[model samples]
Target: MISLADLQRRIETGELSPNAAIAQSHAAIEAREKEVHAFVRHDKSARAQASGPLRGIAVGIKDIIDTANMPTEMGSEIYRGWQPRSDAPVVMMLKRAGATIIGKTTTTAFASRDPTATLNPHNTGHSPGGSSSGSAAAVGAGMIPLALGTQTGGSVIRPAAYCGTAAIKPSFRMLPTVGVKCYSWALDTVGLFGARAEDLARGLLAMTGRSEFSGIVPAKAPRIGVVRQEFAGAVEPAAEQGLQAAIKAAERAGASVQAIDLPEAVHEAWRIHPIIQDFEAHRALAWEFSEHHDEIAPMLRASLDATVGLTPKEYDEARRIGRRGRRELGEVFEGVDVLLTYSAPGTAPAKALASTGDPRYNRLWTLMGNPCVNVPVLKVGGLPIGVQVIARFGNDAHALATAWFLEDALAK
Candidate 1:
């Protein structure tokens, strides 16, 4: 698969030109896209500049985000042939860093529960776990080095897990949300998918100009906390295997690994996530749900229908619990540098074009607005299962570094 960091290194050393780098992706897309269907459409004539940190890298923007040069159909019939006049801030951020906007990747309908046609690169019969389906499959299949996805629930990390790639849901709003379609304004956050953690760090640093994006090893071995999330229900044996393998590897690598139960407040927060999500989504997609009711995806349509009358009081209380839960979650990290958990309930489910797998293991983190990294550590029965690395709300550097540490340990 394409390594964003390796591509940048070659470009920096004059071994590869920026435009040629993009052509490499087009070649891969040309050869594989017929079966993989990872891209909605691509700019074959895309140009690149020989400047900035990310020159020569090819990046895929999720269809949920606007791109001036391409249609943002958003995996829905409603917006077919819809074009944006300008790029999303995040897209411009990538372009400004000298990366070529190669194409638009597939997103589940509105980045919600509805599945996309995009297939998992590892096993096409299994789901790719959208709504960031193509973004994950594209990178995993080596068609591109880096891609953008959004996580309102498990849209980003889960798809990456299913596709066996690295992904990060940065601290809330770390990447701008402007020009991106909103599912739940409270939970929606831009995320990254790449071949490795360091690739994400490099891309993030270039886009945000933040030194904290560096994936440096901690001065001392990290103190790790493991949460099984019994409240979220049992994970499949594959998920349990991946989590256990991660713990063993970290222990061998000198990191302290201990299982810890989440605080009751955090549990309450997890329970209310959908409350906050549905409440906000009702407002966020107000126009679309009202005017384009029939065009809305089926799964999302039922969700909105069932949640149509959520009282403002319920939403207000959910927001209150969410605020208090963040503080409680923040303090949990005082003793542990990072947390390890299941990135998904299991490997991608056997649904070629239907359900995209569960987000139960991921909704809590997304709701708490913490930083999460999915490190692809193992595969079960030919499908991949990833373990999640997490840190406090703003400790994204530690999260990425510790995830890198675990990824390295598992590799050994």
Candidate 2:
């Protein structure tokens, strides 16, 4: 996979010209994109600038995010020819940092649970988790050094896990949501996908100009909390093994590892996650749902149809539980530097192109709006299994730093 940090370092050292670095990605996309189908459309004429921190980096934009120059079809026929007036702030910021917007990667329709045609880079027979399917696959296939994705449920982290790429769904609202298609106002969060934790950290830091994404691994070992979400239902053995591997690696690497019980409020918050998400999704996609019902993706259409009865009073109650859940999560973080869990229910689903893998292991953390990283640890049966490292909301530095640490430990 392409490394954003490595590409920038090479550019700085004059080992590669900015255009040369960008050309490598274009060439990579040419070779791999046919089989992986990681992009909706790639710009053959895109150029990288030599002027900024991310000079020479090629980034893929998820189709749901606005791009003035490209069609943001958003994985649906309804928006086939639509182009926004300007780039989303997230994309504009990446460009300002000297990254080239190489293409718009595939997204699930409106960034919800309908799978795309994008294939998993590891095994085409297995599905790349969505709704950030192509963003993760493009990064996993080494077609681009960086990619942007948004998570309402587990769009960012789950796809990254399935594709074996490092990714972060940072604290809620850390990156602006403007100009992007929103599924849920409270849950939608912009995030990034890259080759490794350091690459994600570098991309995020450059995009936001925030020093918090860049942090040194502390001399003291990180206090790690392992959370097995019983409420999330049965975990596949592959998923269980992946978590065990990370725990063993962390302990061997001198991090303090202990199983942590989560507060009941947090568990209940997971049950109500759909309530908060669907209630807002109604308003967010009201125009299209009301006017172009059949044109919407089948699963999402059915979902919207089913959720039409969700009352505002229920949504209000869900918000109340959500705040309590966030508060309880903050308290949980007081005892540990980060929480460790599964990035997805299992490895990429086999022969389930119509079905992206389950997000059960991810939705709770997303609801709490924590900074979560998917650290690709190992693979089972040729598919990647990533373990999630979650830090308290706004503690994105520790999230990235400790994820880097875990990636290093697992590599050894």
Candidate 3:
């Protein structure tokens, strides 16, 4: 996959045209879309508006995000061929920055656990993690330089990990979600997927008008904390070895690596993630449950039914615990610039498992609302294993740059 920096350089040097840049993505799609199943609908005649900061960049939008020109089927039969009258704010930002809207990528049904047909770019027989399955696969397969995704649970990070791509779940609300389909109002965060950290930095800086994320390199090695949380033992041996390899590389490159334990509040926080997610999901998809219950997937149906018995008091309690965990997390990061951990339990599971891999490794970080970057550091049996870099809430730039630091170290 070409980095956004590489593509942008080509555009500026007259080696690539805005039209030609988009054509490259379409060509990739034509050659691999059947095998990868990354896109739900693509505008065959789409072209960039004109020259701007993002000129010549082709972006894939997850189907849950509204796009006026493409059908946002959202990977569900319920909204098949659905199109919105306007673009989501993030899509508008990309357009204003001169990015070509190449297509609407597939999402799991309503961005929940019902997996989409998208397959891993590394091995078609394995599952490309969801619900951002298509976005991760498309970028990993070299069809596009960047793509948009969302994470309420492990959707963004896990898929990016499985697909061997770099991604960031920026601090909640860092990007506008005006037209995004809501899952859990407090947890659903807009995220970015790309070939590397620098690519994500460029896309985020352009979209938010945030100068802090301008692909800057750190002058000194960061103080890194290696977190061995409660679920660390559950991590596949290969994935753990991959993370250890990354840590060894970091130490060799002059980074200060220290082992740390996750805060106690985090355990309870992990337990409550589902309580918060299910309660909110039940309401977020209330329209579908009320009017077209039979049309939704069975797994989600059981999930909603489970939430039906949860009291408002229970949800409020979960939210309270989550808030406390976020606050305690601030103390946990007091002596470290960032914490590193497994991005997922392991590499992508076989497709025939008929289930997306577990989200155990990602739940606590998601609940904390901190910035998390999935660094593709290790590979086992030819599939990627990602190690994550997480920073305090709202410290997205540090988290991303730290991830870039690790990525560079591994490459050397």
Instruction: Estimate the TM-score of every prediction.
Output: 0.98, 0.98, 0.98
Give the per-residue lDDT of model 2 (tens digit) for 26-85.
999999888999899999999988699898899999999999999999999999989899
Tens-place lDDT per residue, model 3, 193-257, is 99998888888888888888875675258899998676434668877888899999898888999
How much does candidate 2 score in TM-score?
Answer: 0.98
- Write candidate 1's Cα lDDT for 1-412 as tens digits: 8888888888888888888888888899888888788999888887676789988888899999999989999888889999999999999999899888989999888889887888878887888888899999999888999999999988888999989999999999888899999998899999999998889889899999987876455325789999999889878999999999999989998899888999999999889999999999999999999899999999999999999999999999999999888889888988998999999989898874479988988998998989999999899999999999998888888888888888888877
Every candidate's lDDT: 0.90, 0.91, 0.88
Q: Which clashing pairs does model 1 show?
A: none
TM value for model 3: 0.98
CA error at residue 136 for candidate 3, angstroms: 0.2
List runs of model 3 lying over 4 Å from the truth: 231-233
Residue-level error in angstroms, candidate 1, position 228:
0.7
lDDT of 1: 0.90
Candidate numbers, best lDDT first, in rank order: 2, 1, 3
Worst 10 residues of 3 by lDDT: 228-237
